[PDB]
Amino acid sequence: TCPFYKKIPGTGFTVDAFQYGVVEGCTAYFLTHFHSDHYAGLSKHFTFPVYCSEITGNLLKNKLHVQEQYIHPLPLDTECIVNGVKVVLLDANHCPGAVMILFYLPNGTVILHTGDFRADPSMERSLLADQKVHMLYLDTTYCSPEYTFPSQQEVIRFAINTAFEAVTLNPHALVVCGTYSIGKEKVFLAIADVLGSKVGMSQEKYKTLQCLNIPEINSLITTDMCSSLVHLLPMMQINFKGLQSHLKKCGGKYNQILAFRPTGWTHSNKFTRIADVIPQTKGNISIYGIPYSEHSSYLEMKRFVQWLKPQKIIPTVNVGTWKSRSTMEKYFREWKLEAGY
Ligand code: NI
User: Fold this and answer.
1) Which run of H or E residues covers position 295?
2) Which compartments does it reside in?
3) What spacing in Å lies between the alpha carbon of 33 and ligand 1's midpoint?
């Protein structure tokens, strides 16, 4: 059964609610982004309207085979009428095609559902600036002060300079980057660009990348693994066993692997600056864990919410324990008292 925080009161609408069968009263199902926890239950057999971004729509059609007649893509930053209700989609600064959704309820209430997001000051100059929001359904993934990490730009700077230095010292090194879903594409694209290489990968990953509207993509990726010195592999294979095995397959073309595992936050963020990160090493294989986040840090989230000044907040992540829920409610009250709303 569909939980309350995925329902939009006073509409026939649900958000990210595909794993509960036919939801009673739901006339339209919104999908914020193409990550499996959110799309769970969609397939070629789905026969209700789905509303989403153009990119999300390409992925529904090609990867899950959802029939065309049921995919309703909407342009961003544009007031749209869906089943008699005004809605807008805003960029979530998450993975490709991820949106936030503003709902203008018939009774005068305004609701923002962030989906998954990484808050940014640039959001303070979207169509959010124009008016008041009564209810905020908030991505609270890292809603605690210990959750600190660098900007995406600094993390990419570290990876580019690390990769360039290694391959310039040894032209026979191979670079590997881990992946398990869309998002974080800048990691492997930035490294391949500095090295003058295309990124090699499986046919299934190439297919997924081809759905994402990235400019010049045909120039950047390839399924010919042999022509490429940046390879993508599933995240599970980024370990000393999996990388040893991979190196054997390359036919004595390479004599070293430098590999990256983009993670979210890890506890080594509590002690170590990005500059000071070191790899794990075994023989001719090194592995760097790098904290590239597509979710708000604590400070980024607090800034957004204190700017928005919502009347009520409903968390959508970490809602399963009493301790979590209590902790998040304490932070929301501090924020409100500090800012005066
Ligand atoms: Ni996500």
Assistant:
1) none
2) Nucleus
3) 7
Q: What's the CA-to-centroid distance between 138 and ligand 1, angstroms? A: 13
Distance 37 CA to ligand 1 centre (A): 8
Q: Which conformational region is residue 174 in: left (phi greater than 0), alpha (psi within -120 to 50 degrees), or beta?
A: beta
Distance, in Å, from the CA atom of 83 to the CA atom of 10, rounded to the nearest integer, reads: 12
CA of 233 to the centre of ligand 1 (A): 20
CA 308 to ligand 1 centroid distance, Å: 22
Between CA 70 and CA 61 the distance in angstroms is 10
70 CA distance to ligand 1 centroid (A)?
23
Which residue intervals of the chain bear CATH 3.60.15.10?
1-147+296-341
CA 203 from chain center: how many Å?
22
CA 180 to centroid of ligand 1, rounded, Å: 12
| Residue ranges, CATH 3.40.50.12650, the chain | 148-295
What is the CATH architecture of 148-295?
A: 3-Layer(aba) Sandwich (3.40)
Specified resolution (Å) = 1.6
Cβ atoms of residues 61 and 31 within 8 Å: no
Q: Listing from the earlier edge strand, what are the strands of the sheet with 85-91?
A: 80-82, 85-91, 99-104, 110-113, 135-138, 312-315
Locus of tokens 């983009």: 262
Ligand 1: distance of its center to the CA of 53 in Å? 15
Superfamily of domain 1-147+296-341: Ribonuclease Z/Hydroxyacylglutathione hydrolase-like (3.60.15.10)
HSE-CB of 246 using CA atoms within 13 angstroms: 28
**Ligand 1 centre from 152 Cα, in Å?**
16
User: C-alpha angle 13/18/22, rounded to 5°?
Assistant: 70
